[PDB]
Short mmCIF file of C-alpha atoms in Angstrom, two decimals:
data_model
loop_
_atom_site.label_atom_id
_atom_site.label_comp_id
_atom_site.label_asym_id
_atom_site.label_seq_id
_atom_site.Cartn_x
_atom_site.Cartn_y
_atom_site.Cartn_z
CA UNK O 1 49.48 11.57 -24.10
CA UNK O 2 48.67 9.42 -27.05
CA UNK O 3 47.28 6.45 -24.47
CA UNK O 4 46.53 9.22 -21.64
CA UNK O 5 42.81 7.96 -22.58
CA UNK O 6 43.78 4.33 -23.00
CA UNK O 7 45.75 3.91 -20.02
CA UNK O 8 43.58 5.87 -17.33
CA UNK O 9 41.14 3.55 -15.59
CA UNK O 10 40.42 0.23 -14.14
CA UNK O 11 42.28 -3.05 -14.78
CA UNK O 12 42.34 -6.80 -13.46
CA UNK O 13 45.11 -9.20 -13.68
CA UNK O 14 44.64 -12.77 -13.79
CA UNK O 15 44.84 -13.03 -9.91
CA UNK O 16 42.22 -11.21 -9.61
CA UNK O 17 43.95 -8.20 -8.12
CA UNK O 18 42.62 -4.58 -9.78
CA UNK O 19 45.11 -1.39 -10.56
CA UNK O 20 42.90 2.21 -10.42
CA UNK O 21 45.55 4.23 -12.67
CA UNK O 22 45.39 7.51 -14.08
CA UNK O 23 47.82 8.81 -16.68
CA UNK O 24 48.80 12.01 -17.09
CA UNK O 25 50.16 13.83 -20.29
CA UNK O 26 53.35 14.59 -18.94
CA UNK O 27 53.47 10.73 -18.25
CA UNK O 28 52.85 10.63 -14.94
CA UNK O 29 51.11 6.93 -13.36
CA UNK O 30 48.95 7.62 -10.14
CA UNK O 31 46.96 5.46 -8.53
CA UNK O 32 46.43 2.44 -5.90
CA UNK O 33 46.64 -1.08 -6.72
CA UNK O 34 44.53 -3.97 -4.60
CA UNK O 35 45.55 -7.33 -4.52
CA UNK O 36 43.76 -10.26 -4.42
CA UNK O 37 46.49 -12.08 -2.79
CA UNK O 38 49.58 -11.82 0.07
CA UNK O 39 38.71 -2.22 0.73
CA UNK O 40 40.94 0.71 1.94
CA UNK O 41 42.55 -1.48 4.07
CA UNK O 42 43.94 -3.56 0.98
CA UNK O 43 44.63 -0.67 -1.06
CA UNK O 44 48.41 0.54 -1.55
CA UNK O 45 49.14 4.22 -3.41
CA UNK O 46 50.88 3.32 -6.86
CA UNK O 47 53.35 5.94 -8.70
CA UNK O 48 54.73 5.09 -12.20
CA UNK O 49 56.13 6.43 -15.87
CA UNK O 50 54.36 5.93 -19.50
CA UNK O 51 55.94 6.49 -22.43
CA UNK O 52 53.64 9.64 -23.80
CA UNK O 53 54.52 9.01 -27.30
CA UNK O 54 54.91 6.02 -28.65
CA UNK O 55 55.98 5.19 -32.33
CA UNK O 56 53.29 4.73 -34.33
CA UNK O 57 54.03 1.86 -35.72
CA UNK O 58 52.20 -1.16 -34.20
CA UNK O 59 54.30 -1.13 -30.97
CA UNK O 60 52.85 -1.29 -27.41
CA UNK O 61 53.20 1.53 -24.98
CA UNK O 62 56.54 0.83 -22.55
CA UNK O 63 55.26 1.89 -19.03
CA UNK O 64 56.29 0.82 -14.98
CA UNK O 65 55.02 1.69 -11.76
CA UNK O 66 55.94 0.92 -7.85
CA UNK O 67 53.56 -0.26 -5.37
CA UNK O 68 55.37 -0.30 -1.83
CA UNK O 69 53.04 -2.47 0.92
CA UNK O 70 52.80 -0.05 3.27
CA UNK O 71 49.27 1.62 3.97
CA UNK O 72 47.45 3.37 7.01
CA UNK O 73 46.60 0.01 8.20
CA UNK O 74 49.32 -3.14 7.06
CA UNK O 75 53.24 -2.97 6.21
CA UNK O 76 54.24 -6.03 4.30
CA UNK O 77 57.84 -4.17 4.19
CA UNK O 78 58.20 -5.00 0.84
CA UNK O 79 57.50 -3.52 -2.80
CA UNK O 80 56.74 -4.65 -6.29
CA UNK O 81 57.46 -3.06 -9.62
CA UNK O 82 55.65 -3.61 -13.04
CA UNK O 83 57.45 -2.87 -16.35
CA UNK O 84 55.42 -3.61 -19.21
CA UNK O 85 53.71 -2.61 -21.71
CA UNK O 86 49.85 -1.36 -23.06
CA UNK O 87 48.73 -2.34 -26.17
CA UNK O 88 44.91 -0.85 -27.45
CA UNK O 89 42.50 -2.10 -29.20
CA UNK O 90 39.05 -3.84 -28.48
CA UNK O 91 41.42 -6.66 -26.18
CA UNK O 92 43.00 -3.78 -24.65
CA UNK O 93 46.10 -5.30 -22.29
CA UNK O 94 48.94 -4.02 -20.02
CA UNK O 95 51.20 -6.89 -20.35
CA UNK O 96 54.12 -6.92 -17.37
CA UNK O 97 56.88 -8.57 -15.96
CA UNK O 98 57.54 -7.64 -12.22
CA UNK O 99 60.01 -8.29 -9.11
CA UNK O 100 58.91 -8.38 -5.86
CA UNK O 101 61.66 -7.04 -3.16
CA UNK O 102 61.41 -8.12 0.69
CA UNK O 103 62.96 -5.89 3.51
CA UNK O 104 65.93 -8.46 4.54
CA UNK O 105 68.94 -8.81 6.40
CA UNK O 106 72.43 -8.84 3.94
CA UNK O 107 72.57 -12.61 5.09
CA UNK O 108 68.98 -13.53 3.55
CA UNK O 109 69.37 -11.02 0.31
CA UNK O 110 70.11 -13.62 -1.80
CA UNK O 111 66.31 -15.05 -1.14
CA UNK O 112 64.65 -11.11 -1.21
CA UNK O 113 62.84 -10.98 -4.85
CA UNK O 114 59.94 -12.70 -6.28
CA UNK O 115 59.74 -12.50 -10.35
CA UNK O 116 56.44 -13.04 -11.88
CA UNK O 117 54.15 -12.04 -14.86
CA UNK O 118 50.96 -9.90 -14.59
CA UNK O 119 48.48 -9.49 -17.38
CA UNK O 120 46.07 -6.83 -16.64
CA UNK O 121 42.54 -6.32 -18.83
CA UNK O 122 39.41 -3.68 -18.91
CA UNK O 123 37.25 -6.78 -17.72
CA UNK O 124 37.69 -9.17 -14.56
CA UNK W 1 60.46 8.13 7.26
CA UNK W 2 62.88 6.07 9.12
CA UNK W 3 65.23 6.21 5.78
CA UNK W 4 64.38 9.83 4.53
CA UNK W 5 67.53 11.02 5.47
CA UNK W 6 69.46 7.78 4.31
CA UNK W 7 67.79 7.40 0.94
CA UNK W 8 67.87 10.97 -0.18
CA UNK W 9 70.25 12.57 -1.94
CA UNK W 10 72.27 11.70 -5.42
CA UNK W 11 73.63 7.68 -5.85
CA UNK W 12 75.75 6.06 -8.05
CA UNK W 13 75.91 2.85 -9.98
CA UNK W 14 78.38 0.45 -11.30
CA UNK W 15 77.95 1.49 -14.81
CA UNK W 16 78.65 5.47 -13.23
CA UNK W 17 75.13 6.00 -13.28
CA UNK W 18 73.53 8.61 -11.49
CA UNK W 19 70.03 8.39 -9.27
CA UNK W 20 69.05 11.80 -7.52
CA UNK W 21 66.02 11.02 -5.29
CA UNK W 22 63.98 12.79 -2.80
CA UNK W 23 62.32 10.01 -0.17
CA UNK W 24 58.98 11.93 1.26
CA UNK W 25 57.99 11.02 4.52
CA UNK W 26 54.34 9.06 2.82
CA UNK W 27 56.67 6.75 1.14
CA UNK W 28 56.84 9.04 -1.96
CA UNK W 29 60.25 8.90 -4.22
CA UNK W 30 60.88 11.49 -6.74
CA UNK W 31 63.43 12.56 -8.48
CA UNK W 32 66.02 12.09 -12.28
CA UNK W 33 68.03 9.70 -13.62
CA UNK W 34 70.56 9.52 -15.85
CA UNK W 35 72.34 6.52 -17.64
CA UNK W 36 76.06 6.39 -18.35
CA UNK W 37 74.33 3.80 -21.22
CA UNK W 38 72.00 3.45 -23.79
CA UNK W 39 73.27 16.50 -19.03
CA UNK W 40 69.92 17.76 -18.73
CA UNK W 41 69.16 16.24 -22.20
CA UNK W 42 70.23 13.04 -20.15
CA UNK W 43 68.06 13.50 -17.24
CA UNK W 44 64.73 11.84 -17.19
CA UNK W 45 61.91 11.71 -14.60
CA UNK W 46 61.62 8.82 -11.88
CA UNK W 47 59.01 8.41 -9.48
CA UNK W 48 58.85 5.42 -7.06
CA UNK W 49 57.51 4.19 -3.55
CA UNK W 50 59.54 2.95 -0.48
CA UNK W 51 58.39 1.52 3.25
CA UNK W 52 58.73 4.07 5.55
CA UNK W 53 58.92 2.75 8.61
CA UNK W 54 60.82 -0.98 7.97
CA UNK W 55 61.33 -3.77 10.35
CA UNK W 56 63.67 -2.39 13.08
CA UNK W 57 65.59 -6.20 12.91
CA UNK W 58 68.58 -5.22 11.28
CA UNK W 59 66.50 -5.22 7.57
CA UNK W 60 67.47 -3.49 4.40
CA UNK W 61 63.80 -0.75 3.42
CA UNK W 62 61.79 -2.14 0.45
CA UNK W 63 61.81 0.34 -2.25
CA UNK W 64 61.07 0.73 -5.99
CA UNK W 65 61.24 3.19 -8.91
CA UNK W 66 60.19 3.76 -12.42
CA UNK W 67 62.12 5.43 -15.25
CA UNK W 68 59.94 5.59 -18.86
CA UNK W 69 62.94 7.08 -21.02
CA UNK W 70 61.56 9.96 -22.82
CA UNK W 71 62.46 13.37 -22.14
CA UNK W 72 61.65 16.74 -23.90
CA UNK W 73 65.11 15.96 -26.03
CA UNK W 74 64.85 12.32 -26.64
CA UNK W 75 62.37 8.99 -26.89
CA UNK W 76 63.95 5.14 -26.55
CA UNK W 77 60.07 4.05 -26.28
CA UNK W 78 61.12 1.73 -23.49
CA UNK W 79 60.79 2.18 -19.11
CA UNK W 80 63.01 0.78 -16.30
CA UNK W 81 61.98 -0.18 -12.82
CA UNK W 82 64.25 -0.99 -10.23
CA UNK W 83 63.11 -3.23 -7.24
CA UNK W 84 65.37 -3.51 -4.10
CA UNK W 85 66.35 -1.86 -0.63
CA UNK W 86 67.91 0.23 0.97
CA UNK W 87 70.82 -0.29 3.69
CA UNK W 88 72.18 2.39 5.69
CA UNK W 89 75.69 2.51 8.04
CA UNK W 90 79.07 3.82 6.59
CA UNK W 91 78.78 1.67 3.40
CA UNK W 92 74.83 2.83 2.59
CA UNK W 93 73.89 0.75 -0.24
CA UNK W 94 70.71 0.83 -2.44
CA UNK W 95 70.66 -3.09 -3.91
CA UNK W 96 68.74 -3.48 -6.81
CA UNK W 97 67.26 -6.07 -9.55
CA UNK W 98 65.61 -4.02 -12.66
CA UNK W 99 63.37 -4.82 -15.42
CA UNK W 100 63.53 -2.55 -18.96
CA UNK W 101 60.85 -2.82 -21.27
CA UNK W 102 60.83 -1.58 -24.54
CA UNK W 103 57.59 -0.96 -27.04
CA UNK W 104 56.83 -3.85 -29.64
CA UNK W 105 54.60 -5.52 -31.70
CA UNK W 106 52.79 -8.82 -30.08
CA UNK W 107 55.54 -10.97 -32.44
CA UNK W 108 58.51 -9.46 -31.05
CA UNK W 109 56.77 -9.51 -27.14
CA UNK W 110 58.53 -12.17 -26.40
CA UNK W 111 62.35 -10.15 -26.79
CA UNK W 112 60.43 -7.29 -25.24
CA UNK W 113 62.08 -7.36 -21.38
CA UNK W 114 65.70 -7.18 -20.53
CA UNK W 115 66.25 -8.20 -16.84
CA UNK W 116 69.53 -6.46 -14.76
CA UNK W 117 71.41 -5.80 -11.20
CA UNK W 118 72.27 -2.62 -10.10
CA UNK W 119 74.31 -1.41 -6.94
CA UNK W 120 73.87 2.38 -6.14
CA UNK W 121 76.57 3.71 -3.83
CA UNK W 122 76.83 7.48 -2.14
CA UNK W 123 80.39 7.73 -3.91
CA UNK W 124 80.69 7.29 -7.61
CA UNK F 1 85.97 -22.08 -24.27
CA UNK F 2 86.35 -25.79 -22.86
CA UNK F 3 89.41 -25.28 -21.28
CA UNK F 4 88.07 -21.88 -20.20
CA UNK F 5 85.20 -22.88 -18.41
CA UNK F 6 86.17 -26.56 -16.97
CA UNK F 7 86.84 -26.32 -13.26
CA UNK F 8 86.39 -24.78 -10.47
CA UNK F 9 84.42 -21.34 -9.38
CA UNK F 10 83.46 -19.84 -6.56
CA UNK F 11 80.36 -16.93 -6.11
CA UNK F 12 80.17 -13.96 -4.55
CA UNK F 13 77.94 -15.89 -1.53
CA UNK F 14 81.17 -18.78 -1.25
CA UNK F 15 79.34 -21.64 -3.26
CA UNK F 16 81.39 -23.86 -5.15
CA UNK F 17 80.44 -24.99 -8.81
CA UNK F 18 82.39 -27.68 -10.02
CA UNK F 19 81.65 -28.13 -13.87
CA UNK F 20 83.43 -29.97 -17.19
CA UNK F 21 82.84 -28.29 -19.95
CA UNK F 22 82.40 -31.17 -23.06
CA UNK F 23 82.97 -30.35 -26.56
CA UNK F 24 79.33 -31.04 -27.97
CA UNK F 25 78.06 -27.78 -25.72
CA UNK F 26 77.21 -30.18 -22.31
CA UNK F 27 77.61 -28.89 -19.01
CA UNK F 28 78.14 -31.34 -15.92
CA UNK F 29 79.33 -31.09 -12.98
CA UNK F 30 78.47 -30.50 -8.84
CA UNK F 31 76.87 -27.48 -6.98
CA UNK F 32 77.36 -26.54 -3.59
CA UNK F 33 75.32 -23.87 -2.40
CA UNK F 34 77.22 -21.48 1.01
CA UNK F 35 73.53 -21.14 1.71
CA UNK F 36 69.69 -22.66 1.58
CA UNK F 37 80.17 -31.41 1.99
CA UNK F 38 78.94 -34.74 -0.03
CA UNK F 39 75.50 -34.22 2.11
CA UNK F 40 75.84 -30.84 0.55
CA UNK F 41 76.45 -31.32 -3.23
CA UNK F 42 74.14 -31.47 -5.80
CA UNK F 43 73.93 -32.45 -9.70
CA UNK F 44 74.25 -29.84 -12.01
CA UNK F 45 73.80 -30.11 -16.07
CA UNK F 46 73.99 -27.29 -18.89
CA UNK F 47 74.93 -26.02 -21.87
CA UNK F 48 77.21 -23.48 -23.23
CA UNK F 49 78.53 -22.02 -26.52
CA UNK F 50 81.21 -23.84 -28.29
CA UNK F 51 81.71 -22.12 -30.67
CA UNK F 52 81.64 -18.15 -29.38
CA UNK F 53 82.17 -15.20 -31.60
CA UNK F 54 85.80 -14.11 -31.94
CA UNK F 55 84.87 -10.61 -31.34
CA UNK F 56 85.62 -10.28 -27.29
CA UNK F 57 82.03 -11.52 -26.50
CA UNK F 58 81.23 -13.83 -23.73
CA UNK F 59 80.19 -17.00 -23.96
CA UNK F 60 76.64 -17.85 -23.69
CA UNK F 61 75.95 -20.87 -21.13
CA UNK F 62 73.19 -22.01 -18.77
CA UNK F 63 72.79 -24.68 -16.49
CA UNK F 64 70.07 -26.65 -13.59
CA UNK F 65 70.47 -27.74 -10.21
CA UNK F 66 67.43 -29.70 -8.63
CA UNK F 67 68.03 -29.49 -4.99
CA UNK F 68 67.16 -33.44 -4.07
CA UNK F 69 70.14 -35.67 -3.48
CA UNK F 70 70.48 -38.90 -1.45
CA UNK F 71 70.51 -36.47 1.66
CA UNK F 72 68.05 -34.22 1.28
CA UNK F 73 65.12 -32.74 -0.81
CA UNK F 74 63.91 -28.94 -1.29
CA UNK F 75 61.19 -29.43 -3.71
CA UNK F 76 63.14 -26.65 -6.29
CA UNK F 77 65.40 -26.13 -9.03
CA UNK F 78 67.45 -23.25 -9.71
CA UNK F 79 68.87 -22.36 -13.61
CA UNK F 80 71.54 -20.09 -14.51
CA UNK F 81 72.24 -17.99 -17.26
CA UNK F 82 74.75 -16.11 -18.43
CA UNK F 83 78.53 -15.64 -20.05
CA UNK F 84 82.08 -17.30 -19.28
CA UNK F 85 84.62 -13.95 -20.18
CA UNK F 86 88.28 -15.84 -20.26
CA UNK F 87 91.21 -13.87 -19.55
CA UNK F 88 93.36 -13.03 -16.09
CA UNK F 89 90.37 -11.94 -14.40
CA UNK F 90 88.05 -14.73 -15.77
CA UNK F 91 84.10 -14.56 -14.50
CA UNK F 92 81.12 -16.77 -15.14
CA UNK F 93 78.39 -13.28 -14.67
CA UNK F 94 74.60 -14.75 -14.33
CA UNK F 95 70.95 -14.26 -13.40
CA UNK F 96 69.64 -16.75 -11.65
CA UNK F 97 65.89 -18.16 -11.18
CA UNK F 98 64.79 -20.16 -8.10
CA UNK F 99 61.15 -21.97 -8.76
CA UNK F 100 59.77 -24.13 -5.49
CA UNK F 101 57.32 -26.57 -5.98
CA UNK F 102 54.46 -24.51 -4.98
CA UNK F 103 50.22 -25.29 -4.90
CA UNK F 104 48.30 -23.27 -7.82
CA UNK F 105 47.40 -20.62 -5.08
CA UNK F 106 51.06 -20.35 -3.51
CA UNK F 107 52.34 -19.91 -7.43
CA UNK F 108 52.74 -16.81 -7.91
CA UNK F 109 55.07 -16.65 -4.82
CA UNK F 110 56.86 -19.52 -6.72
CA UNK F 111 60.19 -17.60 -8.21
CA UNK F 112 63.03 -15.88 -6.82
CA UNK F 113 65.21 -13.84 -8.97
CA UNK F 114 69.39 -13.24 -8.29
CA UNK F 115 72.64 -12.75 -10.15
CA UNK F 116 75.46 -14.72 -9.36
CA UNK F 117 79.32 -13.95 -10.18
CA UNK F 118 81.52 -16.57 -10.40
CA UNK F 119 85.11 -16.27 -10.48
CA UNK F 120 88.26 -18.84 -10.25
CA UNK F 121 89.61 -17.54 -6.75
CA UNK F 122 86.58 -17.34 -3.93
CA UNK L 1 56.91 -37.90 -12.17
CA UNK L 2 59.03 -39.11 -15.16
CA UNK L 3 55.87 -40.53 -16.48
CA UNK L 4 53.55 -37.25 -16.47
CA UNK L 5 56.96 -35.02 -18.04
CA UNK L 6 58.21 -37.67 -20.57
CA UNK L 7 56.98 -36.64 -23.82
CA UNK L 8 56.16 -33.41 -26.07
CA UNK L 9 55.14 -30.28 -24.67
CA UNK L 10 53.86 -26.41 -27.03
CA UNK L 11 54.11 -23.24 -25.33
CA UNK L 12 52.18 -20.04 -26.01
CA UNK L 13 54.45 -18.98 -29.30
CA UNK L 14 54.28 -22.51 -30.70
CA UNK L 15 57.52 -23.72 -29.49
CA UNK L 16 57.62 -27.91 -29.43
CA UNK L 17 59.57 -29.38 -26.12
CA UNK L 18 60.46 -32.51 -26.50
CA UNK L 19 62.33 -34.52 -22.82
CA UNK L 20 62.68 -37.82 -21.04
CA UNK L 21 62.65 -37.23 -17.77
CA UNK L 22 65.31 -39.89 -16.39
CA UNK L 23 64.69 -41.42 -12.76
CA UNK L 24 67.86 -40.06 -11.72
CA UNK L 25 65.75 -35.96 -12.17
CA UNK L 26 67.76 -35.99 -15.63
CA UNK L 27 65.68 -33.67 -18.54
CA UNK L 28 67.29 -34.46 -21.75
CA UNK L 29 65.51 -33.88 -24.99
CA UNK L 30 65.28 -31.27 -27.85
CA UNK L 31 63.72 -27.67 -28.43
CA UNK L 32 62.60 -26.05 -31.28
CA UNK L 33 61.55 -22.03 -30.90
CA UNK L 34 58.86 -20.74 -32.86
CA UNK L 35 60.49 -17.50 -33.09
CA UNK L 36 64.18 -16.14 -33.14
CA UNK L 37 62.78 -29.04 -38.76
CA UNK L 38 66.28 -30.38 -37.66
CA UNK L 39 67.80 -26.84 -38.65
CA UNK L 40 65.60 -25.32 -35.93
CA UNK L 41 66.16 -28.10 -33.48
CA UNK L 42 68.52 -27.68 -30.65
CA UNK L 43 69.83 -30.02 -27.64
CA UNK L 44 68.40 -29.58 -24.15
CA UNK L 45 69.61 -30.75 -20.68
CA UNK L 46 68.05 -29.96 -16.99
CA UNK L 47 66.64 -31.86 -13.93
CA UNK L 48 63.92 -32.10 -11.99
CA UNK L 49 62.81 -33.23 -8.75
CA UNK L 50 62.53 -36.73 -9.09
CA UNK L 51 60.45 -37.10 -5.52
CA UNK L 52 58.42 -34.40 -5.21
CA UNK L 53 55.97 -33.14 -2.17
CA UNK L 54 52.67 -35.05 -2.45
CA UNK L 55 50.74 -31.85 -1.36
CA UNK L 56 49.42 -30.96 -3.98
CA UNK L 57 52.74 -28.92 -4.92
CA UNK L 58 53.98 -28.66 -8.28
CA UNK L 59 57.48 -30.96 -9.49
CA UNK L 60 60.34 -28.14 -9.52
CA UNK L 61 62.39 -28.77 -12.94
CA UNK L 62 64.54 -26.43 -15.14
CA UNK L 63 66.45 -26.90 -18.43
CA UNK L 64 68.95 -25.12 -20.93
CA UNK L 65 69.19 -24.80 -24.62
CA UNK L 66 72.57 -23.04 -26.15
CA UNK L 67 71.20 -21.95 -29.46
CA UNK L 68 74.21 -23.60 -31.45
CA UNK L 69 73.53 -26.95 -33.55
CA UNK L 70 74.94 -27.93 -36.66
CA UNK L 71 73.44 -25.69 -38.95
CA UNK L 72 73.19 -21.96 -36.98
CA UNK L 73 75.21 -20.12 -33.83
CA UNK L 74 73.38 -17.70 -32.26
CA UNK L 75 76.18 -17.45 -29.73
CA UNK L 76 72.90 -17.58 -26.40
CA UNK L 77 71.53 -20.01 -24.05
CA UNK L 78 68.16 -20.00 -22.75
CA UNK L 79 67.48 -21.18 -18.98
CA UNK L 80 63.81 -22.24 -18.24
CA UNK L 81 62.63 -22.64 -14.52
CA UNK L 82 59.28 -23.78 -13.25
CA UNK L 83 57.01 -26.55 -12.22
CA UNK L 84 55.48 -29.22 -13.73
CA UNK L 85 51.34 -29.69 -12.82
CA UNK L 86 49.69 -32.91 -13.83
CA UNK L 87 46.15 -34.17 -14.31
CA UNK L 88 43.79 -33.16 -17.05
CA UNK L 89 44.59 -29.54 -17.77
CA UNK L 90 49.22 -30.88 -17.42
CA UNK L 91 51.21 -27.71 -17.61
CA UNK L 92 54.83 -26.79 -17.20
CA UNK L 93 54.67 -23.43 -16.16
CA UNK L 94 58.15 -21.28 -16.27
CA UNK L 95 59.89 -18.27 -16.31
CA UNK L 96 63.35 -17.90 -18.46
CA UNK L 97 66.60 -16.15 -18.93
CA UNK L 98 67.87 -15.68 -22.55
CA UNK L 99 71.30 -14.58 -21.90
CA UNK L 100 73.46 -13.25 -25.31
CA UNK L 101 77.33 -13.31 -25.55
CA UNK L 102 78.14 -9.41 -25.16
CA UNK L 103 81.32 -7.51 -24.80
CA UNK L 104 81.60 -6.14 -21.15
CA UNK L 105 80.02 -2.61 -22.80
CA UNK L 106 77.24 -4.29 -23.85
CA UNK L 107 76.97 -6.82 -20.94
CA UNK L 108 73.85 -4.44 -18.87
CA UNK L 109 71.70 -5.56 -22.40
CA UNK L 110 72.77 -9.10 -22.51
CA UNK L 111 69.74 -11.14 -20.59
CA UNK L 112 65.98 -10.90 -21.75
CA UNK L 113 63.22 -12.53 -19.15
CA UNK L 114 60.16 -13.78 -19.90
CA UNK L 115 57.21 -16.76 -19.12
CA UNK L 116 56.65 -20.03 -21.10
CA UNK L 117 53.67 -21.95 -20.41
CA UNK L 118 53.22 -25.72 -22.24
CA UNK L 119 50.61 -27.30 -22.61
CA UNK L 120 50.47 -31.21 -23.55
CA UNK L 121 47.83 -30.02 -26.61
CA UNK L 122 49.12 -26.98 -28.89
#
């Protein structure tokens, strides 16, 4: 993977929240994801994609991953995505977009996803 | 998992889409995808999370996967997640709200993200 | 086009958008939302394409509903966006975003996300 | 309140905002994008709550721009939806839909999303 090394590792978003993530080079995402808002208790497993290959031509990296709220201890019976992308570099950044989705009844679906905007960085 | 049964299996969108997931009973989802938009040239890898034991109050089960869209026969340098739930019963639904980014330079970030509904049904 | 678009629609949840459609691009009009009469109706204004390409495209169009009338006030303001396709099966298809007045900590919980079909028989 | 929106506002790409905020929660002003003088300026409309919670909540607004004037037709509208902060450090944060006229084909690639923040200083 071309940002296998890039990728894998520690970020913080501007919450405050931090994403452990390690990429594989079949572009696998694995990980757990803490949030600073709502210890092992207040981390959540995280599975996502990468592209492995991007072009090589000033783009970012396209990349997702899932977080669902449910651990040993807390269900929040709900789960985010991320879609995004990484761009290198000494500012190194996963910029993403992501929704939100609450466990609701068909009556209250209309009112079950959050959008919002994460930037994560190598440095809280 | 509450929804193991329910979730997996092969689903269909509106756009004849087709989403074959496993549901693992730690709140794993694994499984292909492939687009009627843009064979197992058009099958790619998704990976996501889902609550495994949801609110027992008549709720839909928050779920989430990731698609990035390269293959070992093609690259579009872009991922998909889908946020949404679950609902079981004789008309089993999976309701979703996606977000597809695609690689670019910082200038074109800003057109980077195209934002989508999809409705996955048992019957195509 | 104008004549398209001016009228009345119904979504897929049974609200009722009442909108004229001028011919400088303006949306006006009333909302009424199925979920959360005259206690129940709200201003809406927009915009919208006037001039759409002739090549079976939509047309483009967006508008804003604040939800404070005389009646009541929910501290938020929903904006669609989407496309007006004419025809016997005519549709106003959207994505919609809901932002509540929220503190700086509550923000980020700030924005719902939906799609909305509208179409000229509920 | 009309007083802390009235006025010109820059987002993160550059982009001037310029609305009076009516006491009626009427936006009306103009918009010119960064990206894609009077050629690049474009009519906006929206609302905004006109009495918001005095909680320390943000002032829910939202606003649309069709990207047709007289000089270019890029046959979209852009919805913008978010709050309003005062005091020193003012900010309209949003999130937007930027939905294209498609064909129905194309329709699943018609809307981008995405997050504006202005600021009252560029």
């Amino acid at each position: 993977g071309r940002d296998q090394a890039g990728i894998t590792g520690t970020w913080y978003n501007q919450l405050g929240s931090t994403f452990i993530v390690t990429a594989g080079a079949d572009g696998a995402l694995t990980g757990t994801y803490e949030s600073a808002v709502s210890r092992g208790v207040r981390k959540y497993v995280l599975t996502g994609r990468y592209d492995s290959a991007p072009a090589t031509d000033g783009s970012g990296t396209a990349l997702g991953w899932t977080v669902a709220w449910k651990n040993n201890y807390a269900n929040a019976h709900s789960a985010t995505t991320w879609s995004g992308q990484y761009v290198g570099g000494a500012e190194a950044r996963i910029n993403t977009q992501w929704l939100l989705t609450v466990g609701t009844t068909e009556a209250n679906a209309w009112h079950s996803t959050l959008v919002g905007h994460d930037t994560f960085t190598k440095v809280k």
